[PDB]
Amino acid sequence: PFDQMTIEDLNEVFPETKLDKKKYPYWPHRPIE
């Protein structure tokens, strides 16, 4: 389900939700659009 999962589980199911660490090494790892 959803509640039984974590952020890494979303890395697992949706790689497009990935907050990549190269183009945005800092927090929140992406801009504020």
Partner 1 sequence: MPQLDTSTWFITITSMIMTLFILFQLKISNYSYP
Partner 2 sequence: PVPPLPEHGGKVRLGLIPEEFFQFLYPKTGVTGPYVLGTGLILYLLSKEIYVITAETFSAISTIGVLVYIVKKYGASIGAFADKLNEQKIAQLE
Partner 3 sequence: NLFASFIAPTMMGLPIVTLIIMFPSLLFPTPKRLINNRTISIQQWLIQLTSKQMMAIHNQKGQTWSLMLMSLIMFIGSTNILGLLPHSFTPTTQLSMNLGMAIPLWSATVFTGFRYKTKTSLAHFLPQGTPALLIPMLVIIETISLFIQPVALAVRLTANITAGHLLIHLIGGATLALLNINTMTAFITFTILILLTILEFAVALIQAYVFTLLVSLYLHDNT
Q: Report the interface residues with partner 2, using CB under 8 A.
A: 2-6, 9
Q: Which of 2, 8, 13, 27 touches partner 1 by CB under 8 A?
A: 27
8 Cα distance to chain centroid: 8
Tell me which H or E stretch contains 7.
Answer: helix 7-13
Place of tokens 């939700």: 17
Q: Is 5 in the site for partner 1 (CB under 8 A)?
A: no
Under 8 Å between Cβ of 10 and 17: yes
Q: Is 16 in the site for partner 3 (CB under 8 A)?
A: no
Residues at the site binding partner 3, with contacts judged by CB under 8 A: 2-3, 5-7, 9-10, 26-28, 31-32
